[PDB]
């Protein structure tokens, strides 16, 4: 027969690909270690994070007030049930830091405001 050989070819081919991938990873690690910049990067992240937060607080406050002096924020959705089916349901509410950060494309996980406690998160 030859099916044992065919099955072993496929297993060896998988093992070879896996080892090729580990080899690249081990080569990249060598360069990452040589650059040795993880500490720089952590330091720099806190500096720029501190900057973004401070700048966000400067921009947000008068933005929130301008918005408030023209109706504030409208939240809208369509009504799906009942005698009013079709109409859009509206509301008004204050402009929050989180709407601001979303408006600035800031992923929640990068930079977030604790809207309850009224300060920035770790």
């Amino acid at each position: 027969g030859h099916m044992q050989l065919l099955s072993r070819r496929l297993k060896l081919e998988k093992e070879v690909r896996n080892l090729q991938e580990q080899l690249i990873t081990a080569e990249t690690a060598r360069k990452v270690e040589a650059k040795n910049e993880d500490k720089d990067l952590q330091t720099l992240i806190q500096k720029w994070k501190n900057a973004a937060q401070q700048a966000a607080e400067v921009l947000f406050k008068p933005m929130a007030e301008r918005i408030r002096l023209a109706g504030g924020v409208t939240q809208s959705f369509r009504i799906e049930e009942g005698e009013n089916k079709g109409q859009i349901q509206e509301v008004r509410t204050e402009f929050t830091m989180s709407m601001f950060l979303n408006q600035f494309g800031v992923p929640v996980h990068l930079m977030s405001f604790d809207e309850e406690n009224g300060d920035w998160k770790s």
Binding site: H2, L5, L6, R8, R9, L12, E13, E15, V16, L19, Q20, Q22, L23, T25, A26, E27, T28, A29, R30, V32, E33, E37, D38, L41, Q42, L44, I45, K47, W48, K49, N50, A51, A52, Q54, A55, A56, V58, L59, F104, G105, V106, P107, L110, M111
Partner: protein, 85 residues
């Protein structure tokens, strides 16, 4: 493919695999930390975060600079940064 020929391909794969295990051991030996995947991933996540937050910070500082009618660099001190960062 004859069985013979298939045996030859299988034996070449065996030798390829052996050589790769040997090359991988040599590559890992050059590392302070043998967990190369952790090293590379930790670096990738830091670079990701750094590029993102510096971009965002520069964007916001630029908007503050627009309201103050000045070049962004003039506000870097107020925000605790400089241009080599």
């Amino acid at each position: 493919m004859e069985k013979s020929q298939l045996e030859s391909r299988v034996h070449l794969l065996e030798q390829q695999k052996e050589q790769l295990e040997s090359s991988l051991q040599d590559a890992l030996a050059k590392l302070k930390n043998r967990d190369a995947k952790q090293t590379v991933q930790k670096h990738i996540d830091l670079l990701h975060t750094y590029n993102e937050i510096r971009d965002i910070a520069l964007g916001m500082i630029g908007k503050v600079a627009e309201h103050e009618k000045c070049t962004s660099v003039e506000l870097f001190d107020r925000f605790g940064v400089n241009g080599s960062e």
